[PDB]
Design a protein around this ligand. Sequence first.
Ligand SMILES: C[C@H]1Cc2cc(-c3ccnc4ncnn34)ccc2O1
Length: 310
Amino acid sequence: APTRIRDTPEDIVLEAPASGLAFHPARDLLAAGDVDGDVFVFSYSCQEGETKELWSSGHHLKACRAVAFSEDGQKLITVSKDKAIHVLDVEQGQLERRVSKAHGAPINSLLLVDENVLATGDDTGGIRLWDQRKEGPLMDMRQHEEYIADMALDPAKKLLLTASGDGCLGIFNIKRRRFELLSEPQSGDLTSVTLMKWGKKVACGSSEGTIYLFNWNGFGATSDRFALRAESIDCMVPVTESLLCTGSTDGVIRAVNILPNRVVGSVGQHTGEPVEELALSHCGRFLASSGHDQRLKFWDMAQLRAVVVD
Ligand SMILES: C[C@H]1Cc2cc(-c3ccnc4ncnn34)ccc2O1
C-alpha cells in the first residue's frame, strides 16, 4: 500500500553502456557487464521500486564483453578485453577464480557448455574450450580471421557454432576438440548465431541487416536469406522455435519469424541508440535489451507468444 505494478520491470539506468547481459536460469536476476569492466546483478520486478542493484564488482579493469550464469544458478562467469575469465558467486559478486591470460587477444564471446566446460572467443577469431578441472585450454582454434561475435551450442552438445566478423559460420566438434569447417563467407559480418526450428536451422544475423539460414548438418553454405528493413543486426535471441528478436544500430528491437520468414513487428526501441545485447528471462515472459543509451529495458513477450504459432 500503495503497490504500484507495471507490465514490465522498470528500466535500469546504467552509468556506462553494457555489452554483457544475461538472465539467471531460475531467479528474477539480471546480470550486466560494462565497457569499464564492471559487473552488476540486479533483481527485477513488475512492482515499482523493486528493480534494484543487488551488487556490483570491479574485478575487470577493461570492458566486460560477456557474462553468463551457471546452469545451477550459483555462479556468474565473465570475460573481458583484459583477456581474463572470472568466476563470481551470484550472492555477492565475490571473485572465486581468476583465469588471466586466457587468450592472447581481448575476449568478446562466452558460452557455457555444461557444469564444467565453457567456450570463449576473442577479437582476432581465436576459439578456446575449457574444463574448470583441467589446467590450460582443451582446444585452441584460430581458423577464424576476425572477431568472434557470438556462439551457439548443439542441443546434443557435440558441436559449437561460431559467428565471426570474417563473414563465416564456424563449426567445432567439442567432443573431439577439433575444427570441422567454416561456411562459405558472407558479405556481412556475422554478429549472431542461434538454433531455430527444433535445432534443424541455424540463423545468423549480419552487419548488413540480413538473416542467413543454414540447414543443420549443411553448414557449408546458406539454405536461405532474407533482409530486414534495417542497416544492421548486432544481436539476436530466440523466443520460440520460430520467433527470434533482433537488435540493430537504429535502436529498434524487431520480432522476426523464421520459415515463414517474416518481420512480425517492432517490440520496442532505445530511441536513436544502438541495441548492443538481448537476453530472455528464465520464465520466458521478459526480453531485456541493453543499448548505447545506457539503459536495460524490459519487454513483455506474452503478446508475441500468444500470436506466435509453429
Ligand atoms: C576458464 C576456466 C574457469 C572455468 C569455469 C567453468 C565453470 C564454472 C562454474 N560453472 C560452470 N558452468 C560452465 N562452466 N562453468 C568452466 C570452465 C572453466 O575454465
